[PDB]
């Protein structure tokens, strides 16, 4: 039929690109991995090379120890039985200390201590990775948009695991490390605080997640629609506007009365995406500390019938 | 062999300094462990 430019028709392979040098320590950059045809049908086939520095080593060891702690707790919870491990893999959980321990570090290993150890490992891993995202952009002379967009997700992560439990006075307020157990935690969080639907910042977070899906479906469809004019080369369209950028702007201007630029659409994108967790962290931080019943709060604020 | 480009003398000097650091760390750790065992033996 008509080629919609979703999967490549022809794959071409050349020498692997080793990347730009700039101010990057090339000794900390590994070699190029293999080429993936399966990945090349959709995007780039080349795997690697990766950069491994001091913060990279710290982040990998910390995250590996986090995964190892959770996994060995799961193996203990299975009785060291591999069949039980596979049967109950989604039912295992590393739970925070019980509420009677407050914020103290005196909880036993099977009753909260191991969760604290794993949480320290995760803390170090995630903050090391944030520093890594900053420094990798600094080495190439790029702006630090990735680092400050990652900080928006780190904000919600900190509120869920660190800030709100401290403000609430117990580690039991934090999220367990498990597949079904963190879903149970989410449901019980909504149930305990009234209805999280009636949290205005939960609503804002949902609006911005829906808008992220909206905007990035729109952007992907727009770029694929003008890719016949080389619209996927967005940096060159910013530097030297072509007919792809003009047609993309005019479609949306004729459709909804206003458009963007080849640059400013990505400002819309970054802000719509970061506002999800930006509003989510505020919504979680206000639960239990300021509002204990969100439905009654919405009733008192004109959102629900009295 | 050699990958980082260090001569024999350079490697020997670096190893000497690293070994000094390791011995100071281990001496402090041994003193701390002896103090804890006197305070509360774990055997």
């Amino acid at each position: 039929a008509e080629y919609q430019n979703i999967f490549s028709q022809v794959q071409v392979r050349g020498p692997a690109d080793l990347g730009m040098t700039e101010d990057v320590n090339l000794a900390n950059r590994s070699g190029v991995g293999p080429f993936s045809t399966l990945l090349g049908w959709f995007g780039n086939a080349q795997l690697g090379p990766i950069y491994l520095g001091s913060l990279g080593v710290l982040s990998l060891f910390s995250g590996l120890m986090w995964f190892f702690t959770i996994g060995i707790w799961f193996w203990y919870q299975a009785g060291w039985n591999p069949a039980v491990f596979l049967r109950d893999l989604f039912f295992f959980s590393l739970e925070p200390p019980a509420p009677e321990y407050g914020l103290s570090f005196a909880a036993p290993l099977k009753e909260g201590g191991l969760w604290l150890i794993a949480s320290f490992f995760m803390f170090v891993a995630v903050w090391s990775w944030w520093g890594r995202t900053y420094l990798r952009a600094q080495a190439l002379g790029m702006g630090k948009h990735t680092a400050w967009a990652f900080l928006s997700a780190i904000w919600l992560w900190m509120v869920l695991g660190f800030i709100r439990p401290i403000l609430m006075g117990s580690w039991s307020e934090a999220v367990p490390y498990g597949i079904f157990s963190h879903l149970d935690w989410t449901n019980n969080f909504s149930l305990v605080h009234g209805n999280l639907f009636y949290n205005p910042f939960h609503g804002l977070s949902i609006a911005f997640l829906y808008g992220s899906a909206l905007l990035f479906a729109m952007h992907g469809a727009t770029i694929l629609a003008v890719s016949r004019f080389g619209g996927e080369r967005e940096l060159e369209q910013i530097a030297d506007r072509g007919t792809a950028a003009e047609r993309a702007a005019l479609f949306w201007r004729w459709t909804m009365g206003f458009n963007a630029t080849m640059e400013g659409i990505h400002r819309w994108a970054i802000w719509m995406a970061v506002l999800v967790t930006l509003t989510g962290g505020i919504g979680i931080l206000l639960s239990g500390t300021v509002v204990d019943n969100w439905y009654v709060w919405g009733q008192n604020h004109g959102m629900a019938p009295l | 062999l050699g990958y980082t480009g260090l001569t024999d003398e350079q490697a020997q000097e670096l190893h000497s300094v690293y070994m000094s650091g390791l011995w100071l760390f281990s001496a402090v750790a041994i003193v701390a462990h002896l103090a804890v065992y006197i305070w509360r033996p774990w055997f």
Binding site: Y3, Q9, Q11, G230, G242 | -
Partner: protein, 250 residues
């Protein structure tokens, strides 16, 4: 802090939501002004500035330094659309279509439009040409899918217009950009990969009929394509979808 209000029902949650409303108003203002760096100020259908410029002022100009000694771009700035446009207005009133006064594909108007981009090749990060013929590209080869080289090319009139002789690959992204097609007269044209359908025994180009392949704009250098030439070629081929309609399914 539960239930503590400064006045009325105003607690920290109300303060936070009103603060976010103020912040969102400011952010949306900033975002809309950031997107007025191209195409503004607005103008009438005769090119003169429009009385209505909208509610957002133009942002203060910003400057890009171009990567390879290619100069400096300031936006928003003076506009560059000075090439003649072969369109005549079909109505005295504003807001009605302008009809072509000749062949729209040759004049580059409508869906066949092109922009006066720089008459220089796009460079990768190392200062070399970004798009190169596969045979000129060192070490490049087809790794998956059907190789289109050697296949005949069929237009939308179900007629053969040439044969594929080369693939123009994008060296940094390692993707095929253009197919080089040799015509009857022995000359060659570039066709974007996004506008062709590679089949088992042929390459089908639904946009152009077999007689419109010779009208595709030609590139100056046989081993080099510029942004201007790319833009002209892509505009011609895509305008074929609308201006070659009377020659379909034959």
């Amino acid at each position: 802090m539960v239930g503590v209000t400064a006045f009325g029902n105003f607690d920290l949650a109300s303060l936070a939501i009103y603060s976010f409303w103020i912040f969102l108003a400011g952010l949306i203002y900033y975002l809309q002004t950031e997107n007025m760096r191209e195409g503004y100020p607005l103008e009438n259908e005769d090119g003169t500035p429009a009385a209505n410029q909208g509610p957002f002022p133009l942002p203060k100009p910003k400057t890009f330094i171009l990567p390879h000694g290619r100069g400096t771009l300031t936006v928003p700035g003076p506009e560059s659309e000075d090439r003649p446009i072969a369109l005549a207005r079909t109505a005295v009133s504003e807001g009605f279509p302008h009809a072509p006064t000749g062949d729209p594909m040759k004049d580059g108007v409508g869906p066949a439009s092109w922009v006066a981009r720089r008459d220089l090749p796009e460079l990768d990060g190392h200062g070399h040409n970004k798009i190169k013929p596969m045979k000129a590209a060192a070490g490049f080869h087809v790794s998956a899918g059907k190789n289109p080289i050697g296949l005949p090319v069929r237009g939308c009139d179900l007629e053969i217009a040439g044969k594929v002789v080369d693939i123009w690959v994008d060296i940094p992204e390692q993707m095929a950009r253009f197919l080089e097609v040799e015509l009857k007269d022995g000359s060659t044209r570039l066709l974007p990969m996004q506008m062709v359908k590679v089949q088992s025994n042929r390459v089908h180009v639904n946009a152009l009929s077999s007689d419109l392949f010779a009208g595709i704009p030609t590139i100056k250098s046989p081993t080099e394509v510029t942004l201007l030439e790319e833009d002209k070629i892509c505009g011609y081929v895509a305008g074929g979808l609308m201006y070659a309609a009377p020659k379909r399914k034959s």
